[PDB]
Structure 1
Amino acid sequence: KLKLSDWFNPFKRPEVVTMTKWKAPVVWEGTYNRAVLDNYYAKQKITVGLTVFAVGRYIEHYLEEFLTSANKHFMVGHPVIFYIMVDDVSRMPLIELGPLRSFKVFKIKPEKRWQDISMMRMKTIGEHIVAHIQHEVDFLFCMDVDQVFQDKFGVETLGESVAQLQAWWYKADPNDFTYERRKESAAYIPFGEGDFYYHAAIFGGTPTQVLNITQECFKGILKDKKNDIEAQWHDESHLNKYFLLNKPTKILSPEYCWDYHIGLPADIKLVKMSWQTKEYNVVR
């Protein structure tokens, strides 16, 4: 039977947070024994899914790089199913998948407003989980397409509910977190509250958990629309509210989703995934 000590060695990275107050491991490079987990999960014959949306210019700009890198780095050695949601299945880039990789494409209705595109994913992912994903995989990861796998992103990231530490704020005090601060929004998080600021670019867990994550976030999104308000960082603001109320069983270090435009600090030892485009933190 799998024990935490069978694969997690937090002491290997003493200068960073390797475990939360609620005892969820924060996985950093050097703290995991992937070999042990690979053998463990292989024996259970697990399958992992990955949902990614590419609507509009995003298809030509990031879909191919995202998939080609995913093919090479995502859960290597384990069955993986890529669920690709596009608005125009014709612009689809054509790539060869390697061993244990396969895919399923779905044509979706494109939202006109980009923020809507980002948020509607919560709705779409949920529908698909109920319709088929719950029957196809043991774990599911939902990701932004505007990123690229730089190295192995494996089973060490698997968990019941998994969150990603946001690259910009992983060392910040919660009061500096860009949580939704208006009480009128369902994503509202009071100053003086919060554990971490999670990035909406990557989140996952078992289909059941992801279903709950997406259903709750989408309901918050809908509520805000009827209350004439929209969370500062849309689905990400709601995701942070959700993870605050429902603590994740695993958190991935910013090494699993790094922003090269803020450089490469000492704590980032081996990037597994990186943002594709430079993004500002404007307030004025």
Structure 2
Amino acid sequence: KLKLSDWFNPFKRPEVVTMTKWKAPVVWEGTYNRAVLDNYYAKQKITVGLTVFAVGRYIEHYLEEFLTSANKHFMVGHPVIFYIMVDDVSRMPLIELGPLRSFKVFKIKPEISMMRMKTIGEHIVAHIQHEVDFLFCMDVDQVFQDKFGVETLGESVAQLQAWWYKADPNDFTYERRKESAAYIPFGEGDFYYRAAIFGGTPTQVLNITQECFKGILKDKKNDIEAQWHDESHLNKYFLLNKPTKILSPEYCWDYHIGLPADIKLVKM
């Protein structure tokens, strides 16, 4: 019986959001008790999955930085399977993994980013749902800078792009054309999440992906194409299906200093 008060204490970061209306916590540095959490999840023997996609140019410029740092910082102290989806199984490096880590590489027709939603679901059903309790999907052009632990585990986990204080939903770059499924009306929405990271339990992540791919399809099948590809649909999704856990910007930062705990370099 894990109480939100066993590992989380919102009063540790007053200047930021730590609780969303639907009572879901917003994880920022110093608000989580990872030691408590490691004790907890260890008694259940959980395994965390991470699916990264690298195609063409990305494999040479990023796949390795990802895996290397993911190995040193991702869910350390827990079994973790790394799911590598690439278009060319030979350009992909094989770094040495540490205790409790393993990978599984798959070849994918480099037929786009939106089409990734489909493959991700296909595998959750095919095998991921059986091998891990939670799953995180990330952009390859990222680098972990510090421990990204179980304090990020959740049923439905979303990444905040940024934050301020009451932000006016009108200035979020949601999809505004009503002909799109990613459509979010002005003066509405809670936060603007990054597609660069998002996770949850295989079942939940299958709904996230299955839901987006369908929406992406509709717009594909209507000549329209949502503003920020995946990010549009994904932000439309956490609007209808409020995530159960939100990670602060300190878990997918664009720049490089402060306490990032993971950085999005996105093509240098």
Query: Same fold judged by TM-score > 0.5?
Result: yes
Contact 1:70–1:148 (Cα < 8 Å) also in 2: yes
Counterpart CA distance in 2 for 1:267 and 1:74 is 10
Counterpart CA distance in 2 for 1:272 and 1:30 is 30
Q: Deviations over 1:135-172 (max 9, x none)?
A: 00000000000110000000000000000001377874
Aligned with residue 246 of structure 1, among 241, 250, 259: 241
Counterpart CA distance in 2 for 1:158 and 1:168 is 21
**Cα distance, 1:121 vs structure 2:** 1.0
Counterpart CA distance in 1 for 2:126 and 2:164 is 36
Extract structure 1 runs of 4+ deviating beyond 6 A.
Answer: 168-171, 261-273
Q: 1:139 to 1:52 in 2, by over 3 A?
A: same
TM-score (norm 1): 0.89
Alignment match, 2:70: 70
Counterpart CA distance in 2 for 1:68 and 1:93 is 10
Q: 1:264 to 1:131 in 2, by over 3 A?
A: closer
Counterpart CA distance in 2 for 1:166 and 1:237 is 13
Q: Deviations over 1:208-246 (max 9, x none)?
A: 100000000000000001111000000110000110000
Q: Deviations over 1:64-123 (max 9, x none)?
A: 000000000000000000000000011011210001110100000102xxxxx2111100
**Cα distance, 1:259 vs structure 2:** 1.2
Contact 1:53–1:84 (Cα < 8 Å) also in 2: yes
Counterpart CA distance in 2 for 1:125 and 1:136 is 14
Q: 1:60 to 1:170 in 2, by over 3 A?
A: farther
170-179 or 159-168, which deviates more: 170-179
Counterpart CA distance in 1 for 2:88 and 2:265 is 35
Q: 1:24 to 1:121 in 2, by over 3 A?
A: same
Counterpart CA distance in 1 for 2:262 and 2:244 is 22
Q: 1:157 to 1:271 in 2, by over 3 A?
A: farther
Counterpart CA distance in 2 for 1:209 and 1:171 is 28
Q: Deviations over 1:238-261 (max 9, x none)?
A: 000110000000000000001117
Percent identity of paired positions between Structure 1 and Structure 2: 100
169-178 or 183-192, which deviates more: 169-178
Q: 1:74 to 1:170 in 2, by over 3 A?
A: farther
Contact 2:195–2:230 (Cα < 8 Å) also in 1: yes
